[model samples]
Target: STGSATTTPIDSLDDAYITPVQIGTPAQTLNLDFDTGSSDLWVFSSETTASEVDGQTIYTPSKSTTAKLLSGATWSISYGDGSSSSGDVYTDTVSVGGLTVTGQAVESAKKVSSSFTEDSTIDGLLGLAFSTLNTVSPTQQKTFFDNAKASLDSPVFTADLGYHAPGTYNFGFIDTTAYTGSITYTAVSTKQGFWEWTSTGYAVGSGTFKSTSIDGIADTGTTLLYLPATVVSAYWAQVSGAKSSSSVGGYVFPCSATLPSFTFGVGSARIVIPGDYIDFGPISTGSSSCFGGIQSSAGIGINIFGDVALKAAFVVFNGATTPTLGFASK
Candidate 1:
């Protein structure tokens, strides 16, 4: 099970996540990373001619078991990490969590510059972040939620941010059985689709980040929070005189002690991060070690409190009621 991933099946093109359609017929099944930070469902195709695509799902229109292409719409995707790809928009009956959403708009990259082709396991990514973040939007297109919202039992959506076997993430209502106490509530933001917020302070253990002022944003859209170096160094400073060791791409420490508790003030709601979050390496190697949550990114713009910090909560994004932000316990 070490190499296993959470998978759901889609029955028809409509059940694929939206409406049903065909591209050119797929040779095999594809499993993608359902993302909330982006709005593009991209899969690697055998026809790609880019350099950075590796580890991404490759849907071969010529040999896939079930797939299709969108009209003649051509597509090109550029990543936040400075990579690009060009492909055609295709329609595929995507399957996940045993559900199907047909006519799901997917980008079939023919020239991907991301690391999507090297690996054989990971083939594609399904953006679940927000409709506004979709790569192909000129006026903001609803990605998955737009189509699936009507079909769900409730307006509720849950992202598991799985820490175990499958690294599970779910959309729709939050299961009450997953948590102990009542779900907490946090007001939503009005800043477009960012759901940005100003954190009163970022606190870990009994220590608080000083100069950085550590503002937090519950960003399901971002992969990780980009923390300031000064604040990160100071927080890690207390762990056995531990200083942030720059390796594995983020700040790291040498000790194996339990991490301190971290909490961010979101309006009246005080969202807390358990000690186990930091105990698990920030790089997430399936190991419990002395971990540091904040990482250093030279040109990274704002400090984002990513999904890891916002997990275990029933989140409500109310754009219908004037772009409001809200959080509650399931």
Candidate 2:
């Protein structure tokens, strides 16, 4: 079976993209962040203390006749950006687009960090990464994609993220019409529970592509494109007033600076990211200082090809053997 869901951008192009998913018997709807970087489907729930959950929507499993609590099962997850949530577990019917999975593990958050509480738009995260990364103790939980794969025409999903616009998350089958040109395929390393790949090289602006292998992950939940410090520095050098400021945090530049385009190499395909996309936005309201969307992933171990980079191309997360990543220009 084939299914498709519309993805709406929550904020400017930088914030997480939200998609609707139905849970439980009566179908409580929640706007979830489809994250390819992490595992475990979790949501703000009634289990969460009122003080912990602010204005965000909460999933109430007790109200759903189909919801069943798993005895002694618990879950805790933390992101690279330091966001975290933990709570109990329940098995219930979960549906997305037109696809449904029975007895899907649903993690209900009892405690949430400020990072998640402050950003009230996102109700939860739907992890598409490898199931081994699931945070459920004793027994691991399968992802929505994993559980629904058997019923799908093909075990694949396509992410079409656009700049400051709505896109789509197509499931079960690939939509050739959504992208232009031949898709470039790359081998992914799932050993780390991520869509991790190596870039043969990269380029700054109109310069020749440099020869360097950068290990990175394609993460839909993250906002900016993160790379090695040297790589980030090389790109900013081309900008007029770019500087690494401690006070402002990260590399900031003049709002009027003419930025250069960035490109990543996946096998033989070079996916180009426009210059304007790199200038994330002004640091603050009415300020001349603008933050560079591309930053250093010094301590993060693996670099991230976040929304800033993914929006420039049509991506296919192939679930077949070896789990390859297919990219094509939009």
Candidate 3:
């Protein structure tokens, strides 16, 4: 059997998208951020402190007859952006679209950091990264896709993110109608539990495509694109009034400045982000200064092709023996 799910943009403020999943017997629904960058299916739950539960919905396992706690099992995660959540574990029936996985590990949050408590819209995260990255204590847990792969018609999923528009995430099959042109495939390394890959090179505007090996991860949860400082400096240099803003802590330019296009390479495939898209709105509402969507990832270790970049292309997270990534123009 095959399964498919459509996700809608939860917030334009940060461009986080979420999908609904049914958990346990009788099906309790919860909206989750399907993150490919991390592996852990954690959610706000009855175990969460009332003070920590603001506008978010909580998951209740007690109501589900199929829910069973895994004694002594626990899970904890801290994201690069400082958001953190820790919880106990339970095994239950989890369903996405119409596909169901029995005995799936569901981590119920007991505590969450300020970053999560403050933004109460996100109920939890559905991790799509390799199962090896699962944060379950003592034993690793398999992701929904991993547990349900054998039953799938095709071991693949497509990420179609939009700008201030609703997007869809198709599981077990690729919707050819969602993309244009042929999908260019690139080899991926799952050694790190991430969909890690290298880009052939990049170019700013119509400038010559320089052959520079850039290592990065395709992250749907991240809001902006992060590149090497050297590459960032080179791109910003082309724009007038662009400078590193200590106040905003990145490159910033006048809202009226004319920006150039940014292009990234995947084999022979060259995907370009328009000049207007490079300017990620204003730094502050009613302010003339704007922030660059692409920034330096010097401290982040691995560069990230986040939502800002992902939305510019249609992405395929191929789950074959040797996992790969396919990109095409949206």
The number of the candidate with the highest lDDT is 2
Candidate 3 per-residue lDDT over residues 1-330, each given as its tens digit = 777777878776446888889998889899999999998999999999888998998889999999999889999999988889998999999998888999999999999998888877789999999999899998889998899888888998889887777788888888889988999999999988899999889999889998989999999988888999999999999999999887898999999998998999999998888787677768988989989988999999999998878888999999998899999998
The superposed Cα distance between candidate 1 and the true structure at residue 98, in angstroms, equals 4.3
| Per-residue accuracy of model 1 over 195-300 as CA lDDT, tens digit each | 5556555666776543234544556534444666665665566566345545555556654665566666655455666655554343455544344555554566
Note the Cα lDDT for every prediction shown: 0.52, 0.91, 0.89
lDDT of 2 at 225: 95
Candidate 2 segments whose C-alpha is farther than 4 A from its true place: none
Backbone clashes (count) for model 3: 0
Which structure among the candidates has the greatest TM-score? 2
Compared with the true structure, model 2 gives a TM-score of 0.98
Off by over 4 Å in 1: 1-28, 50-57, 62-68, 137-141, 190-192, 207-217, 220-223, 244-250, 256-258, 279-291, 296-298, 311-330
Pairs in steric clash, model 3: none
Ranked by lDDT, top first: 2, 3, 1
The C-alpha local distance difference test score for the whole of candidate 3 amounts to 0.89
Clashing pairs in 2: 1-153
